[PDB]
PDB file of C-alpha atoms (C1' of nucleotides) and ligand atoms in Angstrom:
ATOM      1  CA  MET R   1      84.365  55.879  -5.161  1.00 33.91           C
ATOM      2  CA  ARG R   2      84.444  58.796  -7.624  1.00 34.14           C
ATOM      3  CA  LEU R   3      87.484  60.815  -8.762  1.00 34.40           C
ATOM      4  CA  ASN R   4      86.223  63.653  -6.527  1.00 32.49           C
ATOM      5  CA  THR R   5      85.234  61.659  -3.381  1.00 25.83           C
ATOM      6  CA  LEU R   6      88.838  60.473  -2.719  1.00 24.26           C
ATOM      7  CA  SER R   7      90.748  62.260   0.061  1.00 25.26           C
ATOM      8  CA  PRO R   8      94.087  61.764   1.871  1.00 22.32           C
ATOM      9  CA  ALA R   9      94.662  60.467   5.408  1.00 20.11           C
ATOM     10  CA  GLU R  10      94.426  63.091   8.173  1.00 19.95           C
ATOM     11  CA  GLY R  11      97.908  64.404   9.049  1.00 19.81           C
ATOM     12  CA  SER R  12      99.430  63.351   5.689  1.00 22.40           C
ATOM     13  CA  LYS R  13      99.557  66.851   4.168  1.00 22.36           C
ATOM     14  CA  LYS R  14     100.763  69.942   6.095  1.00 22.86           C
ATOM     15  CA  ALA R  15     100.435  72.968   3.719  1.00 24.05           C
ATOM     16  CA  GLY R  16     103.918  74.534   4.226  1.00 22.44           C
ATOM     17  CA  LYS R  17     105.431  77.683   5.762  1.00 22.59           C
ATOM     18  CA  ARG R  18     104.957  80.631   3.373  1.00 21.31           C
ATOM     19  CA  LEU R  19     107.255  83.441   4.514  1.00 21.98           C
ATOM     20  CA  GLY R  20     106.518  87.148   4.092  1.00 17.53           C
ATOM     21  CA  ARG R  21     102.700  87.122   3.897  1.00 17.09           C
ATOM     22  CA  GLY R  22     101.469  89.650   6.468  1.00 22.32           C
ATOM     23  CA  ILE R  23     101.164  89.809  10.258  1.00 23.52           C
ATOM     24  CA  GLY R  24      98.267  87.326  10.545  1.00 25.23           C
ATOM     25  CA  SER R  25     100.415  84.548   9.040  1.00 28.56           C
ATOM     26  CA  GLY R  26     102.685  84.765  12.120  1.00 26.32           C
ATOM     27  CA  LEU R  27     105.888  84.391  10.160  1.00 25.35           C
ATOM     28  CA  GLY R  28     105.865  87.447   7.888  1.00 27.02           C
ATOM     29  CA  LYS R  29     108.280  90.406   7.748  1.00 24.38           C
ATOM     30  CA  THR R  30     111.638  88.787   8.570  1.00 25.01           C
ATOM     31  CA  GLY R  31     110.422  85.309   7.596  1.00 24.98           C
ATOM     32  CA  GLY R  32     111.239  83.600  10.889  1.00 26.56           C
ATOM     33  CA  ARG R  33     114.884  84.791  10.793  1.00 28.54           C
ATOM     34  CA  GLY R  34     115.071  87.776  13.194  1.00 29.73           C
ATOM     35  CA  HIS R  35     116.578  91.247  12.813  1.00 25.50           C
ATOM     36  CA  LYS R  36     119.849  91.726  10.875  1.00 25.45           C
ATOM     37  CA  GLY R  37     123.106  89.767  11.175  1.00 24.61           C
ATOM     38  CA  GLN R  38     124.787  87.326   8.809  1.00 24.69           C
ATOM     39  CA  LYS R  39     122.089  84.639   9.221  1.00 26.26           C
ATOM     40  CA  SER R  40     119.264  87.040   8.241  1.00 25.90           C
ATOM     41  CA  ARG R  41     120.970  87.747   4.888  1.00 23.27           C
ATOM     42  CA  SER R  42     120.207  85.976   1.604  1.00 22.49           C
ATOM     43  CA  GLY R  43     122.891  83.346   1.068  1.00 20.65           C
ATOM     44  CA  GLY R  44     123.799  83.875   4.725  1.00 20.06           C
ATOM     45  CA  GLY R  45     124.757  81.483   7.506  1.00 19.30           C
ATOM     46  CA  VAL R  46     128.258  80.135   8.176  1.00 21.09           C
ATOM     47  CA  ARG R  47     129.746  76.936   6.730  1.00 19.13           C
ATOM     48  CA  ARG R  48     129.747  73.555   8.518  1.00 20.57           C
ATOM     49  CA  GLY R  49     131.951  73.160  11.600  1.00 18.68           C
ATOM     50  CA  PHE R  50     132.525  76.917  11.933  1.00 15.60           C
ATOM     51  CA  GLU R  51     132.671  78.079  15.573  1.00 16.48           C
ATOM     52  CA  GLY R  52     133.141  81.837  15.096  1.00 16.67           C
ATOM     53  CA  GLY R  53     136.835  81.687  14.152  1.00 15.36           C
ATOM     54  CA  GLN R  54     137.712  79.489  17.143  1.00 13.63           C
ATOM     55  CA  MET R  55     139.679  76.395  16.122  1.00 17.02           C
ATOM     56  CA  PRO R  56     136.931  73.843  15.286  1.00 16.01           C
ATOM     57  CA  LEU R  57     136.344  70.547  17.156  1.00 16.98           C
ATOM     58  CA  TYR R  58     137.251  68.624  13.965  1.00 14.56           C
ATOM     59  CA  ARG R  59     140.683  70.387  13.957  1.00 15.87           C
ATOM     60  CA  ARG R  60     141.604  70.844  17.658  1.00 15.64           C
ATOM     61  CA  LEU R  61     141.190  67.054  18.148  1.00 15.27           C
ATOM     62  CA  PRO R  62     143.950  64.778  16.782  1.00 16.96           C
ATOM     63  CA  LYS R  63     143.429  62.505  13.793  1.00 17.31           C
ATOM     64  CA  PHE R  64     143.917  58.762  14.297  1.00 16.64           C
ATOM     65  CA  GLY R  65     143.992  55.402  12.554  1.00 18.28           C
ATOM     66  CA  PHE R  66     144.230  54.080   9.018  1.00 16.76           C
ATOM     67  CA  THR R  67     141.547  52.569   6.770  1.00 16.18           C
ATOM     68  CA  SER R  68     142.240  48.868   6.259  1.00 13.34           C
ATOM     69  CA  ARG R  69     142.316  47.388   2.765  1.00 16.47           C
ATOM     70  CA  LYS R  70     141.383  43.924   4.022  1.00 18.50           C
ATOM     71  CA  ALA R  71     138.326  45.123   6.018  1.00 21.15           C
ATOM     72  CA  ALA R  72     136.753  46.469   2.792  1.00 20.09           C
TER      73      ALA R  72
ATOM     74  C1'   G T   1     116.563  98.916   2.924  1.00 21.90           C
ATOM     75  C1'   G T   2     112.286  95.862   1.923  1.00 24.29           C
ATOM     76  C1'   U T   3     109.748  91.034   2.451  1.00 20.49           C
ATOM     77  C1'   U T   4     102.370  90.825   0.453  1.00 20.72           C
ATOM     78  C1'   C T   5      95.853  86.760   3.639  1.00 22.77           C
ATOM     79  C1'   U T   6      93.403  85.320   8.748  1.00 18.21           C
ATOM     80  C1'   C T   7      92.352  83.151  13.567  1.00 20.61           C
ATOM     81  C1'   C T   8      94.057  79.758  18.274  1.00 18.59           C
ATOM     82  C1'   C T   9      98.137  77.998  22.169  1.00 19.63           C
ATOM     83  C1'   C T  10     103.026  78.928  24.477  1.00 21.99           C
ATOM     84  C1'   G T  11     106.546  82.710  24.510  1.00 20.29           C
ATOM     85  C1'   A T  12     112.312  84.641  25.158  1.00 18.20           C
ATOM     86  C1'   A T  13     117.267  87.234  25.165  1.00 16.86           C
ATOM     87  C1'   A T  14     120.370  91.473  25.089  1.00 14.97           C
ATOM     88  C1'   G T  15     124.125  86.553  29.863  1.00 17.49           C
ATOM     89  C1'   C T  16     128.699  83.047  30.343  1.00 14.07           C
ATOM     90  C1'   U T  17     132.579  81.062  27.319  1.00 11.82           C
ATOM     91  C1'   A T  18     135.625  81.534  22.613  1.00  9.94           C
ATOM     92  C1'   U T  19     136.798  84.182  18.378  1.00 12.29           C
ATOM     93  C1'   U T  20     142.068  89.069  13.372  1.00 11.34           C
ATOM     94  C1'   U T  21     136.561  89.061  17.973  1.00 10.96           C
ATOM     95  C1'   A T  22     133.867  93.289  19.817  1.00 11.89           C
ATOM     96  C1'   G T  23     127.319  96.166  15.496  1.00 10.99           C
ATOM     97  C1'   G T  24     129.400  88.934  13.044  1.00  9.53           C
ATOM     98  C1'   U T  25     129.607  83.849  14.568  1.00 10.57           C
ATOM     99  C1'   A T  26     129.706  79.247  17.473  1.00 13.10           C
ATOM    100  C1'   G T  27     128.570  75.698  22.370  1.00 12.92           C
ATOM    101  C1'   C T  28     126.069  76.384  26.969  1.00 12.31           C
ATOM    102  C1'   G T  29     122.056  79.383  29.704  1.00 16.16           C
ATOM    103  C1'   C T  30     116.666  81.326  28.579  1.00 16.26           C
ATOM    104  C1'   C T  31     111.853  80.352  24.202  1.00 16.65           C
ATOM    105  C1'   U T  32     109.106  76.390  21.492  1.00 17.66           C
ATOM    106  C1'   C T  33     107.205  71.623  19.838  1.00 16.35           C
ATOM    107  C1'   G T  34     107.509  66.140  20.535  1.00 15.11           C
ATOM    108  C1'   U T  35     108.499  61.659  23.404  1.00 18.39           C
ATOM    109  C1'   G T  36     109.682  59.535  28.042  1.00 20.17           C
ATOM    110  C1'   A T  37     110.170  59.103  32.997  1.00 22.58           C
ATOM    111  C1'   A T  38     110.760  59.247  39.734  1.00 24.09           C
ATOM    112  C1'   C T  39     107.300  62.405  44.615  1.00 21.51           C
ATOM    113  C1'   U T  40     111.203  64.950  40.303  1.00 17.68           C
ATOM    114  C1'   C T  41     110.389  70.668  41.338  1.00 14.14           C
ATOM    115  C1'   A T  42     108.755  75.312  43.951  1.00 15.34           C
ATOM    116  C1'   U T  43     106.683  77.337  48.526  1.00 14.86           C
ATOM    117  C1'   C T  44     106.392  77.049  54.052  1.00 14.73           C
ATOM    118  C1'   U T  45     107.513  74.306  59.097  1.00 18.00           C
ATOM    119  C1'   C T  46     111.088  71.741  61.764  1.00 20.40           C
ATOM    120  C1'   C T  47     116.096  69.576  61.630  1.00 21.19           C
ATOM    121  C1'   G T  48     121.966  68.732  59.873  1.00 21.45           C
ATOM    122  C1'   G T  49     125.488  71.969  57.883  1.00 20.52           C
ATOM    123  C1'   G T  50     129.819  75.291  56.289  1.00 19.13           C
ATOM    124  C1'   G T  51     130.677  80.430  56.522  1.00 17.41           C
ATOM    125  C1'   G T  52     133.825  85.078  58.497  1.00 18.75           C
ATOM    126  C1'   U T  53     129.959  89.716  55.159  1.00 19.58           C
ATOM    127  C1'   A T  54     127.119  93.720  58.194  1.00 17.91           C
ATOM    128  C1'   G T  55     128.231  95.069  62.870  1.00 18.02           C
ATOM    129  C1'   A T  56     131.865  95.072  66.563  1.00 16.85           C
ATOM    130  C1'   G T  57     136.788  94.846  68.659  1.00 19.12           C
ATOM    131  C1'   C T  58     142.357  96.172  69.090  1.00 17.44           C
ATOM    132  C1'   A T  59     146.304  90.038  71.360  1.00 17.51           C
ATOM    133  C1'   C T  60     148.340  89.975  65.941  1.00 18.64           C
ATOM    134  C1'   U T  61     149.237  93.309  60.555  1.00 18.83           C
ATOM    135  C1'   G T  62     149.683  98.319  60.326  1.00 19.91           C
ATOM    136  C1'   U T  63     148.062 103.153  61.927  1.00 23.58           C
ATOM    137  C1'   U T  64     146.779 106.806  65.657  1.00 25.69           C
ATOM    138  C1'   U T  65     146.199 110.911  70.460  1.00 28.33           C
ATOM    139  C1'   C T  66     147.196 111.620  75.198  1.00 23.65           C
ATOM    140  C1'   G T  67     149.168 110.449  80.159  1.00 24.16           C
ATOM    141  C1'   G T  68     153.004 107.502  82.731  1.00 23.12           C
ATOM    142  C1'   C T  69     157.786 104.735  82.830  1.00 20.63           C
ATOM    143  C1'   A T  70     162.152 105.663  80.727  1.00 18.87           C
ATOM    144  C1'   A T  71     166.170 102.675  78.425  1.00 17.93           C
ATOM    145  C1'   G T  72     168.744 105.302  73.810  1.00 18.58           C
ATOM    146  C1'   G T  73     170.159 110.338  72.742  1.00 20.67           C
ATOM    147  C1'   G T  74     170.718 116.324  71.922  1.00 21.50           C
ATOM    148  C1'   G T  75     172.942 120.533  74.054  1.00 22.02           C
ATOM    149  C1'   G T  76     176.712 122.001  78.259  1.00 23.04           C
ATOM    150  C1'   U T  77     181.189 121.756  82.064  1.00 22.97           C
ATOM    151  C1'   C T  78     185.921 120.417  83.578  1.00 21.19           C
ATOM    152  C1'   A T  79     191.900 118.940  84.972  1.00 18.38           C
TER     153        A T  79
HETATM  154  K1    K P 101     125.975  87.042  35.454  1.00 15.89           K
HETATM  155 MG1   MG P 102      94.043  68.124   6.935  1.00 17.86          MG
HETATM  156 MG1   MG P 103      96.466  74.291   7.392  1.00 17.68          MG
HETATM  157 MG1   MG P 104      97.829  72.138  -1.968  1.00 14.72          MG
HETATM  158 MG1   MG P 105     106.726  73.251  -1.691  1.00 13.18          MG
HETATM  159 MG1   MG P 106     106.709  81.585  -0.381  1.00 14.07          MG
HETATM  160 MG1   MG P 107     103.541  80.417  13.450  1.00 12.80          MG
HETATM  161 MG1   MG P 108     105.606  86.262  15.765  1.00 14.57          MG
HETATM  162 MG1   MG P 109     113.725  80.336  12.885  1.00 16.27          MG
HETATM  163 MG1   MG P 110     115.024  94.696   8.703  1.00 14.23          MG
HETATM  164 MG1   MG P 111     121.659  93.890  16.123  1.00 10.79          MG
HETATM  165 MG1   MG P 112     120.458  86.915  14.220  1.00 12.25          MG
HETATM  166 MG1   MG P 113     122.515  87.219  -2.755  1.00 13.57          MG
HETATM  167 MG1   MG P 114     126.837  83.287   0.797  1.00 17.44          MG
HETATM  168 MG1   MG P 115     149.174  60.887   9.897  1.00 19.40          MG
HETATM  169 MG1   MG P 116     100.656  84.039  28.584  1.00 17.82          MG
HETATM  170 MG1   MG P 117     138.382  79.437  29.160  1.00 14.63          MG
HETATM  171 MG1   MG P 118     137.340  86.006  29.583  1.00 11.63          MG
HETATM  172 MG1   MG P 119     128.959  90.569  20.554  1.00 10.95          MG
HETATM  173 MG1   MG P 120     130.870  93.376  12.409  1.00 11.34          MG
HETATM  174 MG1   MG P 121     108.316  70.504  26.998  1.00  8.73          MG
HETATM  175 MG1   MG P 122     108.921  59.643  17.038  1.00 11.82          MG
HETATM  176 MG1   MG P 123     110.969  64.725  48.626  1.00 13.08          MG
HETATM  177 MG1   MG P 124     116.554  65.381  40.717  1.00 10.22          MG
HETATM  178 MG1   MG P 125     111.063  71.520  49.203  1.00 10.31          MG
HETATM  179 MG1   MG P 126     117.992  75.274  63.609  1.00  8.94          MG
HETATM  180 MG1   MG P 127     121.441  73.818  63.738  1.00  9.16          MG
HETATM  181 MG1   MG P 128     128.636  79.463  62.037  1.00  8.69          MG
HETATM  182 MG1   MG P 129     134.294  92.776  58.777  1.00  7.61          MG
HETATM  183 MG1   MG P 130     132.925  97.396  58.884  1.00  9.73          MG
HETATM  184 MG1   MG P 131     141.338  94.130  75.144  1.00 10.40          MG
HETATM  185 MG1   MG P 132     141.799  97.790  76.093  1.00  9.48          MG
HETATM  186 MG1   MG P 133     147.957  89.892  56.811  1.00  8.87          MG
HETATM  187 MG1   MG P 134     154.116  94.191  58.021  1.00  7.50          MG
HETATM  188 MG1   MG P 135     151.509 106.541  68.360  1.00  9.69          MG
HETATM  189 MG1   MG P 136     153.341 111.030  74.356  1.00  7.17          MG
END
RNA sequence: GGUUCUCCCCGAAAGCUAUUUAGGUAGCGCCUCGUGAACUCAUCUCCGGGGGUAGAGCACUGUUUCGGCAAGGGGGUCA
């Protein structure tokens, strides 16, 4: 084996999605994120457990129990 | 507002629900890729079903025009 002749296993490497590089790329102009809206914007997207202003599942359900000191 | 090379396969939605929500967002529904599974699924034929729509009708709910039957009544007449 030479330093050139080495090569990786097939399927190991996968290039990567490069957004905004023409029509032919596929993704390109709106880099796979649609037209307008909060999610299209830079630094967009809502925080975790946010259901559009509806009271979230992790708040409409009651909280229960106590963490045991002895179990630790 | 703009988001820069190329070819191959599949290919939506503009609905429901909720929202200080309504040009935003979230779960489901529809798109995709992956992994599993039964004759699963569609079509047609023949069965077993529940409708109470279209249409129709007037016993009931109401409405409606005649004719008949008139209880009930409106005007008159007395000592
Ligand atoms: K509908
Ligand atoms: Mg390779
Ligand atoms: Mg490649
Ligand atoms: Mg490289
Ligand atoms: Mg990288
Ligand atoms: Mg890039
Ligand atoms: Mg692509
Ligand atoms: Mg595209
Ligand atoms: Mg995307
Ligand atoms: Mg745009
Ligand atoms: Mg829009
Ligand atoms: Mg969007
Ligand atoms: Mg920014
Ligand atoms: Mg931000
Ligand atoms: Mg407590
Ligand atoms: Mg096609
Ligand atoms: Mg509800
Ligand atoms: Mg509603
Ligand atoms: Mg909306
Ligand atoms: Mg808005
Ligand atoms: Mg599939
Ligand atoms: Mg796996
Ligand atoms: Mg069968
Ligand atoms: Mg089944
Ligand atoms: Mg069948
Ligand atoms: Mg039959
Ligand atoms: Mg039958
Ligand atoms: Mg029947
Ligand atoms: Mg009818
Ligand atoms: Mg009718
Ligand atoms: Mg009859
Ligand atoms: Mg009759
Ligand atoms: Mg009735
Ligand atoms: Mg009545
Ligand atoms: Mg009548
Ligand atoms: Mg009459």
